[PDB]
Amino acid sequence: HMARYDSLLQALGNTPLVGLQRLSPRWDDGRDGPHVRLWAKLEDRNPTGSIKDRPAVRMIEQAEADGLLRPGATILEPTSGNTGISLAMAARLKGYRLICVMPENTSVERRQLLELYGAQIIFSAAEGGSNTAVATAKELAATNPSWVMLYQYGNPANTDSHYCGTGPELLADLPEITHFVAGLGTTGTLMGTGRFLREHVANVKIVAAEPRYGEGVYALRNMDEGFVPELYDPEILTARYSVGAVDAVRRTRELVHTEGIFAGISTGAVLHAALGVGAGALAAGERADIALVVADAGWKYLSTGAYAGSLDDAETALEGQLWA
Amino acid sequence: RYDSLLQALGNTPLVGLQRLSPRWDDGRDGPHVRLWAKLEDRNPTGSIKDRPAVRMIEQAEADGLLRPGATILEPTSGNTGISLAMAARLKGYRLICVMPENTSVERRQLLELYGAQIIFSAAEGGSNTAVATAKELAATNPSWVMLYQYGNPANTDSHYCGTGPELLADLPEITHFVAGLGTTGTLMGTGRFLREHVANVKIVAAEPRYGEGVYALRNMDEGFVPELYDPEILTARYSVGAVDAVRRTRELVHTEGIFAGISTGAVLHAALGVGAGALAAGERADIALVVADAGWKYLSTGAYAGSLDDAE
């Protein structure tokens, strides 16, 4: 036995870390100085194809250990994007009923996909900005004590899945890590992976990549202004890079072209930040081993037209598109 | 842990389907009849075709057919094209895919994203004029090499040396192996390996019903019989309709949370038929089946929702 599992939930994490020899500023050290290396952590190697499998499973089993989820409970979650798929898969495999509260703009194709997983989907209506999914789910949950809202936006088990998973896994394959670059959505990946790495690597850099394009996890929400995510700790990040549509898209196209990795649209932001951090490593003469997260694959996004034709069409195509 | 995407190939998960299995748990009603899903969507481009693609290039290199400036030519519109694009690129070859004018526009962009040049064969000459045009094209100069997945023993060898050993390692109690019949590489290579090392193992082909295409699968009456195909290897063959393939594919998501492509439904239908028969016979079964790819490329086809009749 090398990879025999009794359930799909066991085939989670322990994802590949793949060196990018072509796309890296300099893979081999030499005459002009130390190497600047990019390493890609392939989180699409997960049950549903995204990094959200980790926190989804960890939230349920924390809720079990905490005694909130008992055998016949229904999980109620305000959601969008990859978390919808991950929670649907995880709830089912764990024997729970799931209701997803989703913003009224969710596609019918995506509704039907989650319903095939067994989730009941409730659309909140929202005559305002993007939606009211959270407050609706919170009210529904208040209706029945065996109805439990996990709330990924503020659930510590979100960041714990990366402190206990993504982080230790990174440090095991990349003891020489100098930088960690990931997308900033709920902040779980950054806060959890980052706290772990900072406790073990003396001045590792934790770099937030922040897409300026599409829609993120908080899109389904009405937020207070210039908000702070509930999971966010202000002393973990050492840097943030804000990344535009055109830059994101050509980085994603380059990754496929030169490394054969077909990544999701959030990885464009991550790659751009990473390459900019890398270009700094010797403008400064310094060595770099930069781990970067590929949080999902392109399959889900190629319908968009974001990988085809002109970068103008691609940029236009990213409008209104969930990247998380 | 990998210096290259190509190292992250094979060694795929085998996952027990506790809910969808006829009988997961041995009881006093009789022995277990278990389904185990071999997840080949966990390969670099998301399909089982990364295996033969990588091995066919490797073999061609060994045979002295491929030197630095070579272009590989292959007739393919499907998963082999994608696999060979990724693999050719990382190995530093050029790839031309030959597909008919009638092929989609979505694939074009997919294949060209992975770095592939596309030449269009005459429309209304099927995937056969496509093969003949590719042969003709490759004959125009020695720098152009056609691998030819339907006759290339490296396709089979990839499964003999990869898929088979992995299955045996993870599922030593295996009684049945079930896979779709397309090039036949998967069944032939893994079947031959398992039959060498597992005394009474049964190798079961899932084929499409005549005229009812199931993506990636071939019916050998209707189509050309791949040169790779050895009749003696198979102990059984099930023909699977579209409706059955589609409803098994949906049922795999619903019961097991695995989002697979439609060949996996066909394979599931054959496997459930085998399992049903074992259940009724009172005989234990551990049935390994191939999940060849994921459902993403099929979902716009409307066959994960709506009526089964509308699944086209």
PDB file of N, CA, C and O in Angstrom, chain A residues 116-162:
ATOM      1  N   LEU A 116     -26.274  18.560  -7.256  1.00  0.00           N
ATOM      2  CA  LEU A 116     -25.897  17.183  -7.587  1.00  0.00           C
ATOM      3  C   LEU A 116     -25.013  16.552  -6.495  1.00  0.00           C
ATOM      4  O   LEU A 116     -25.120  15.337  -6.220  1.00  0.00           O
ATOM      5  N   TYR A 117     -24.151  17.375  -5.885  1.00  0.00           N
ATOM      6  CA  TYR A 117     -23.417  16.993  -4.672  1.00  0.00           C
ATOM      7  C   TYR A 117     -24.328  16.712  -3.462  1.00  0.00           C
ATOM      8  O   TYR A 117     -23.885  16.093  -2.497  1.00  0.00           O
ATOM      9  N   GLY A 118     -25.575  17.181  -3.505  1.00  0.00           N
ATOM     10  CA  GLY A 118     -26.550  16.948  -2.449  1.00  0.00           C
ATOM     11  C   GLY A 118     -26.897  18.163  -1.621  1.00  0.00           C
ATOM     12  O   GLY A 118     -27.704  18.080  -0.702  1.00  0.00           O
ATOM     13  N   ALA A 119     -26.286  19.303  -1.923  1.00  0.00           N
ATOM     14  CA  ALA A 119     -26.578  20.522  -1.180  1.00  0.00           C
ATOM     15  C   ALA A 119     -27.946  21.088  -1.581  1.00  0.00           C
ATOM     16  O   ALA A 119     -28.303  21.078  -2.764  1.00  0.00           O
ATOM     17  N   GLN A 120     -28.689  21.597  -0.597  1.00  0.00           N
ATOM     18  CA  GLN A 120     -29.832  22.457  -0.880  1.00  0.00           C
ATOM     19  C   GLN A 120     -29.287  23.860  -0.998  1.00  0.00           C
ATOM     20  O   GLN A 120     -28.572  24.324  -0.113  1.00  0.00           O
ATOM     21  N   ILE A 121     -29.648  24.536  -2.078  1.00  0.00           N
ATOM     22  CA  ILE A 121     -29.198  25.897  -2.333  1.00  0.00           C
ATOM     23  C   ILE A 121     -30.368  26.854  -2.118  1.00  0.00           C
ATOM     24  O   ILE A 121     -31.438  26.685  -2.698  1.00  0.00           O
ATOM     25  N   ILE A 122     -30.144  27.832  -1.249  1.00  0.00           N
ATOM     26  CA  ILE A 122     -31.033  28.955  -1.053  1.00  0.00           C
ATOM     27  C   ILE A 122     -30.348  30.214  -1.600  1.00  0.00           C
ATOM     28  O   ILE A 122     -29.242  30.572  -1.191  1.00  0.00           O
ATOM     29  N   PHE A 123     -31.010  30.880  -2.533  1.00  0.00           N
ATOM     30  CA  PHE A 123     -30.574  32.194  -2.942  1.00  0.00           C
ATOM     31  C   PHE A 123     -31.112  33.228  -1.975  1.00  0.00           C
ATOM     32  O   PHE A 123     -32.311  33.278  -1.707  1.00  0.00           O
ATOM     33  N   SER A 124     -30.212  34.038  -1.431  1.00  0.00           N
ATOM     34  CA  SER A 124     -30.611  35.290  -0.822  1.00  0.00           C
ATOM     35  C   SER A 124     -30.810  36.234  -1.989  1.00  0.00           C
ATOM     36  O   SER A 124     -30.156  36.081  -3.024  1.00  0.00           O
ATOM     37  N   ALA A 125     -31.743  37.168  -1.843  1.00  0.00           N
ATOM     38  CA  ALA A 125     -31.866  38.282  -2.773  1.00  0.00           C
ATOM     39  C   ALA A 125     -31.041  39.408  -2.179  1.00  0.00           C
ATOM     40  O   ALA A 125     -30.897  39.496  -0.954  1.00  0.00           O
ATOM     41  N   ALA A 126     -30.482  40.271  -3.015  1.00  0.00           N
ATOM     42  CA  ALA A 126     -29.779  41.425  -2.474  1.00  0.00           C
ATOM     43  C   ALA A 126     -29.853  42.658  -3.356  1.00  0.00           C
ATOM     44  O   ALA A 126     -29.047  42.814  -4.279  1.00  0.00           O
ATOM     45  N   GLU A 127     -30.807  43.537  -3.040  1.00  0.00           N
ATOM     46  CA  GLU A 127     -30.943  44.827  -3.715  1.00  0.00           C
ATOM     47  C   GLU A 127     -29.880  45.799  -3.168  1.00  0.00           C
ATOM     48  O   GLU A 127     -30.204  46.865  -2.623  1.00  0.00           O
ATOM     49  N   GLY A 128     -28.608  45.420  -3.319  1.00  0.00           N
ATOM     50  CA  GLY A 128     -27.496  46.188  -2.745  1.00  0.00           C
ATOM     51  C   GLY A 128     -26.099  45.612  -2.958  1.00  0.00           C
ATOM     52  O   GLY A 128     -25.656  44.718  -2.218  1.00  0.00           O
ATOM     53  N   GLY A 129     -25.413  46.118  -3.984  1.00  0.00           N
ATOM     54  CA  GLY A 129     -23.956  45.973  -4.116  1.00  0.00           C
ATOM     55  C   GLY A 129     -23.400  44.617  -4.538  1.00  0.00           C
ATOM     56  O   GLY A 129     -22.530  44.543  -5.420  1.00  0.00           O
ATOM     57  N   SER A 130     -23.866  43.546  -3.893  1.00  0.00           N
ATOM     58  CA  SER A 130     -23.378  42.193  -4.196  1.00  0.00           C
ATOM     59  C   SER A 130     -24.189  41.077  -3.524  1.00  0.00           C
ATOM     60  O   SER A 130     -24.546  40.104  -4.192  1.00  0.00           O
ATOM     61  N   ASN A 131     -24.431  41.195  -2.211  1.00  0.00           N
ATOM     62  CA  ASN A 131     -25.515  40.438  -1.549  1.00  0.00           C
ATOM     63  C   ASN A 131     -25.675  40.522  -0.010  1.00  0.00           C
ATOM     64  O   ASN A 131     -25.042  41.349   0.665  1.00  0.00           O
ATOM     65  N   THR A 132     -26.591  39.673   0.485  1.00  0.00           N
ATOM     66  CA  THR A 132     -27.016  39.582   1.879  1.00  0.00           C
ATOM     67  C   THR A 132     -26.930  38.119   2.392  1.00  0.00           C
ATOM     68  O   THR A 132     -27.586  37.753   3.374  1.00  0.00           O
ATOM     69  N   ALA A 133     -26.111  37.301   1.727  1.00  0.00           N
ATOM     70  CA  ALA A 133     -26.003  35.858   2.025  1.00  0.00           C
ATOM     71  C   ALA A 133     -25.729  35.552   3.499  1.00  0.00           C
ATOM     72  O   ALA A 133     -26.331  34.644   4.077  1.00  0.00           O
ATOM     73  N   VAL A 134     -24.841  36.326   4.113  1.00  0.00           N
ATOM     74  CA  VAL A 134     -24.415  36.055   5.483  1.00  0.00           C
ATOM     75  C   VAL A 134     -25.549  36.216   6.493  1.00  0.00           C
ATOM     76  O   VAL A 134     -25.804  35.312   7.288  1.00  0.00           O
ATOM     77  N   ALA A 135     -26.223  37.361   6.449  1.00  0.00           N
ATOM     78  CA  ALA A 135     -27.312  37.659   7.374  1.00  0.00           C
ATOM     79  C   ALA A 135     -28.490  36.691   7.207  1.00  0.00           C
ATOM     80  O   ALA A 135     -29.111  36.288   8.193  1.00  0.00           O
ATOM     81  N   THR A 136     -28.779  36.312   5.963  1.00  0.00           N
ATOM     82  CA  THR A 136     -29.798  35.300   5.703  1.00  0.00           C
ATOM     83  C   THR A 136     -29.400  33.965   6.330  1.00  0.00           C
ATOM     84  O   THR A 136     -30.189  33.383   7.072  1.00  0.00           O
ATOM     85  N   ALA A 137     -28.177  33.488   6.069  1.00  0.00           N
ATOM     86  CA  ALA A 137     -27.725  32.204   6.625  1.00  0.00           C
ATOM     87  C   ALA A 137     -27.742  32.231   8.158  1.00  0.00           C
ATOM     88  O   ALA A 137     -28.165  31.280   8.808  1.00  0.00           O
ATOM     89  N   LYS A 138     -27.299  33.338   8.727  1.00  0.00           N
ATOM     90  CA  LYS A 138     -27.304  33.515  10.172  1.00  0.00           C
ATOM     91  C   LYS A 138     -28.727  33.397  10.763  1.00  0.00           C
ATOM     92  O   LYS A 138     -28.917  32.795  11.824  1.00  0.00           O
ATOM     93  N   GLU A 139     -29.718  33.950  10.062  1.00  0.00           N
ATOM     94  CA  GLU A 139     -31.125  33.899  10.512  1.00  0.00           C
ATOM     95  C   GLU A 139     -31.701  32.495  10.390  1.00  0.00           C
ATOM     96  O   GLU A 139     -32.419  32.036  11.280  1.00  0.00           O
ATOM     97  N   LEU A 140     -31.378  31.823   9.285  1.00  0.00           N
ATOM     98  CA  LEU A 140     -31.810  30.455   9.059  1.00  0.00           C
ATOM     99  C   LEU A 140     -31.234  29.548  10.149  1.00  0.00           C
ATOM    100  O   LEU A 140     -31.968  28.787  10.785  1.00  0.00           O
ATOM    101  N   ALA A 141     -29.929  29.647  10.384  1.00  0.00           N
ATOM    102  CA  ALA A 141     -29.274  28.883  11.443  1.00  0.00           C
ATOM    103  C   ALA A 141     -29.953  29.086  12.813  1.00  0.00           C
ATOM    104  O   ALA A 141     -30.044  28.156  13.597  1.00  0.00           O
ATOM    105  N   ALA A 142     -30.409  30.306  13.086  1.00  0.00           N
ATOM    106  CA  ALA A 142     -31.056  30.643  14.355  1.00  0.00           C
ATOM    107  C   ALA A 142     -32.404  29.929  14.545  1.00  0.00           C
ATOM    108  O   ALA A 142     -33.013  30.000  15.612  1.00  0.00           O
ATOM    109  N   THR A 143     -32.841  29.220  13.512  1.00  0.00           N
ATOM    110  CA  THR A 143     -34.161  28.632  13.459  1.00  0.00           C
ATOM    111  C   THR A 143     -34.229  27.259  14.150  1.00  0.00           C
ATOM    112  O   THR A 143     -35.309  26.833  14.571  1.00  0.00           O
ATOM    113  N   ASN A 144     -33.080  26.585  14.269  1.00  0.00           N
ATOM    114  CA  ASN A 144     -33.004  25.186  14.701  1.00  0.00           C
ATOM    115  C   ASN A 144     -31.638  24.959  15.354  1.00  0.00           C
ATOM    116  O   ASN A 144     -30.618  25.238  14.724  1.00  0.00           O
ATOM    117  N   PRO A 145     -31.595  24.457  16.613  1.00  0.00           N
ATOM    118  CA  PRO A 145     -30.268  24.301  17.251  1.00  0.00           C
ATOM    119  C   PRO A 145     -29.337  23.247  16.614  1.00  0.00           C
ATOM    120  O   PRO A 145     -28.116  23.306  16.821  1.00  0.00           O
ATOM    121  N   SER A 146     -29.914  22.299  15.878  1.00  0.00           N
ATOM    122  CA  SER A 146     -29.155  21.308  15.080  1.00  0.00           C
ATOM    123  C   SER A 146     -28.769  21.833  13.688  1.00  0.00           C
ATOM    124  O   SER A 146     -28.260  21.075  12.846  1.00  0.00           O
ATOM    125  N   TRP A 147     -29.042  23.119  13.449  1.00  0.00           N
ATOM    126  CA  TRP A 147     -28.601  23.819  12.249  1.00  0.00           C
ATOM    127  C   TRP A 147     -27.406  24.674  12.647  1.00  0.00           C
ATOM    128  O   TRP A 147     -27.525  25.578  13.457  1.00  0.00           O
ATOM    129  N   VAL A 148     -26.243  24.361  12.093  1.00  0.00           N
ATOM    130  CA  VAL A 148     -24.993  24.967  12.533  1.00  0.00           C
ATOM    131  C   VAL A 148     -24.338  25.700  11.372  1.00  0.00           C
ATOM    132  O   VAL A 148     -24.118  25.109  10.318  1.00  0.00           O
ATOM    133  N   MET A 149     -24.037  26.984  11.567  1.00  0.00           N
ATOM    134  CA  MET A 149     -23.296  27.773  10.573  1.00  0.00           C
ATOM    135  C   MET A 149     -21.811  27.727  10.891  1.00  0.00           C
ATOM    136  O   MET A 149     -21.401  28.171  11.944  1.00  0.00           O
ATOM    137  N   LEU A 150     -21.006  27.200   9.975  1.00  0.00           N
ATOM    138  CA  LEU A 150     -19.548  27.084  10.193  1.00  0.00           C
ATOM    139  C   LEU A 150     -18.839  28.433  10.119  1.00  0.00           C
ATOM    140  O   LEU A 150     -17.963  28.737  10.920  1.00  0.00           O
ATOM    141  N   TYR A 151     -19.243  29.228   9.142  1.00  0.00           N
ATOM    142  CA  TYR A 151     -18.756  30.580   8.942  1.00  0.00           C
ATOM    143  C   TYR A 151     -17.241  30.629   8.673  1.00  0.00           C
ATOM    144  O   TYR A 151     -16.450  30.963   9.547  1.00  0.00           O
ATOM    145  N   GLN A 152     -16.872  30.306   7.438  1.00  0.00           N
ATOM    146  CA  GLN A 152     -15.466  30.208   7.036  1.00  0.00           C
ATOM    147  C   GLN A 152     -14.690  31.540   7.144  1.00  0.00           C
ATOM    148  O   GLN A 152     -13.478  31.544   7.350  1.00  0.00           O
ATOM    149  N   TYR A 153     -15.406  32.649   7.023  1.00  0.00           N
ATOM    150  CA  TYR A 153     -14.823  33.985   7.106  1.00  0.00           C
ATOM    151  C   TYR A 153     -14.204  34.302   8.465  1.00  0.00           C
ATOM    152  O   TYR A 153     -13.298  35.145   8.567  1.00  0.00           O
ATOM    153  N   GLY A 154     -14.725  33.674   9.508  1.00  0.00           N
ATOM    154  CA  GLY A 154     -14.249  33.895  10.859  1.00  0.00           C
ATOM    155  C   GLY A 154     -13.906  32.645  11.635  1.00  0.00           C
ATOM    156  O   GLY A 154     -13.566  32.736  12.804  1.00  0.00           O
ATOM    157  N   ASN A 155     -13.968  31.478  11.007  1.00  0.00           N
ATOM    158  CA  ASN A 155     -13.696  30.234  11.724  1.00  0.00           C
ATOM    159  C   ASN A 155     -12.199  29.947  11.824  1.00  0.00           C
ATOM    160  O   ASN A 155     -11.556  29.723  10.803  1.00  0.00           O
ATOM    161  N   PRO A 156     -11.644  29.911  13.047  1.00  0.00           N
ATOM    162  CA  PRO A 156     -10.221  29.600  13.275  1.00  0.00           C
ATOM    163  C   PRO A 156      -9.695  28.307  12.641  1.00  0.00           C
ATOM    164  O   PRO A 156      -8.494  28.197  12.359  1.00  0.00           O
ATOM    165  N   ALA A 157     -10.587  27.328  12.471  1.00  0.00           N
ATOM    166  CA  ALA A 157     -10.269  26.063  11.825  1.00  0.00           C
ATOM    167  C   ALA A 157      -9.849  26.266  10.355  1.00  0.00           C
ATOM    168  O   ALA A 157      -9.147  25.436   9.802  1.00  0.00           O
ATOM    169  N   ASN A 158     -10.339  27.345   9.738  1.00  0.00           N
ATOM    170  CA  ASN A 158      -9.866  27.811   8.430  1.00  0.00           C
ATOM    171  C   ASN A 158      -8.347  28.020   8.514  1.00  0.00           C
ATOM    172  O   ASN A 158      -7.589  27.240   7.941  1.00  0.00           O
ATOM    173  N   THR A 159      -7.893  29.002   9.285  1.00  0.00           N
ATOM    174  CA  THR A 159      -6.442  29.206   9.405  1.00  0.00           C
ATOM    175  C   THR A 159      -5.704  28.003  10.030  1.00  0.00           C
ATOM    176  O   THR A 159      -4.589  27.741   9.625  1.00  0.00           O
ATOM    177  N   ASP A 160      -6.330  27.221  10.916  1.00  0.00           N
ATOM    178  CA  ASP A 160      -5.670  26.016  11.465  1.00  0.00           C
ATOM    179  C   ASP A 160      -5.377  24.951  10.415  1.00  0.00           C
ATOM    180  O   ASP A 160      -4.389  24.241  10.521  1.00  0.00           O
ATOM    181  N   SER A 161      -6.226  24.811   9.408  1.00  0.00           N
ATOM    182  CA  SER A 161      -5.956  23.815   8.372  1.00  0.00           C
ATOM    183  C   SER A 161      -4.616  24.054   7.643  1.00  0.00           C
ATOM    184  O   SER A 161      -4.003  23.110   7.179  1.00  0.00           O
ATOM    185  N   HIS A 162      -4.189  25.318   7.554  1.00  0.00           N
ATOM    186  CA  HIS A 162      -2.928  25.714   6.924  1.00  0.00           C
ATOM    187  C   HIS A 162      -1.759  25.749   7.885  1.00  0.00           C
ATOM    188  O   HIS A 162      -0.624  25.499   7.490  1.00  0.00           O
TER     189      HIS A 162
END
